[PDB]
Design a protein around this ligand. Sequence first.
Ligand SMILES: Cc1cc([C@@H]2CCCN2S(C)(=O)=O)no1
Length: 93
Amino acid sequence: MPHAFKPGDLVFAKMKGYPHWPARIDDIADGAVKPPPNKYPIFFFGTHETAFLGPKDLFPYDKSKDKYGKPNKRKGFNEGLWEIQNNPHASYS
Ligand SMILES: Cc1cc([C@@H]2CCCN2S(C)(=O)=O)no1
């Protein structure tokens, strides 16, 4: 049975106006800015951008990859597909 989301989990994350996007739940470094309540820090592969999202916009990657893991015209998306498949827990800083 599913647990709550935790740092390191792999997802497709949905933002308004963008396709479901390969991403991970990030940790928060000591001294770093914390997300709002009920929000997680999402790192988006390919773009390497961070936004704060709740579970309604988070699709676990294993279940969802057949549907959402296909190339997209959008900037950074196909780099992002490589990262989530090949080195999803690397430093991209
Ligand atoms: C992670 C992380 C944060 C830091 C900074 C700089 C030195 C002390 N800290 S802090 C202000 O206590 O977060 N080092 O590693």
